[PDB]
Amino acid sequence: IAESPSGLYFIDNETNSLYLFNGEIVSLSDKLGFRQWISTHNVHVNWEP
Amino acid sequence: VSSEFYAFKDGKMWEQFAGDYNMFFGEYKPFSITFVANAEEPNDKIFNT
Amino acid sequence: ALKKEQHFFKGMQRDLSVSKFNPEYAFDAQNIRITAREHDTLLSVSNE
Numbered sequence A: 001i002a003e004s005p006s007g008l009y010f011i012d013n014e015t016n017s018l019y020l021f022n023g024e025i026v027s028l029s030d031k032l033g034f035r036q037w038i039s040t041h042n043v044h045v046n047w048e049p
Numbered sequence B: 001v002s003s004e005f006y007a008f009k010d011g012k013m014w015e016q017f018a019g020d021y022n023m024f025f026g027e028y029k030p031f032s033i034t035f036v037a038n039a040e041e042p043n044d045k046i047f048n049t
Numbered sequence C: 001a002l003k004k005e006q007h008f009f010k011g012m013q014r015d016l017s018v019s020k021f022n023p024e025y026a027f028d029a030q031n032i033r034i035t036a037r038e039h040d041t042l043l044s045v046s047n048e
Helices: A035-040
Strands: A008-012 A017-021 A025-027 B006-009 B012-015 B032-034 C028-030
Touching: A017 A035
Parallel strands: none
Antiparallel strands: A008 A017, A017 A025, B006 B012, B032 C028
16 A cells, blocks of 8 residues: 555455555556556465565 | 355366366366458458458 | 458457447357456457
8 A cells, every 4th residue: 555645556466456546446457457467466475574 | 265266066166267278167168259240241242261 | 352351359249230240349259258367368369
């Protein structure tokens, strides 16, 4: 999750997309063509340094 | 279930989109595509290639 | 020969007359995917 003036960029592993919330949810991965890259790089383990 | 799509048939759970192509529940099913060829439909055409 | 016609596959359509079908749609299809899944096969017919 990254906060910005435009909205909230978050990556949902379940749906395999890179969303942006700005009042309405927008799947940036689908709009700009990144569905495969995210669907191949997803895992269940949470982030840790 | 989690980030994976599952199925249930014949008393067993089949994980989808993980095996070899065109093999559904251990059986090979074909794939096909039908598309009408109607260009200059008022004219009588001979389909050559 | 004399003429040619390119056909694209944007989905599948039915219920329309053969005389007025559209080249960008398919009339029937079994076990195909027109979306990029596991590869960059978006708008290109691929196996299921």
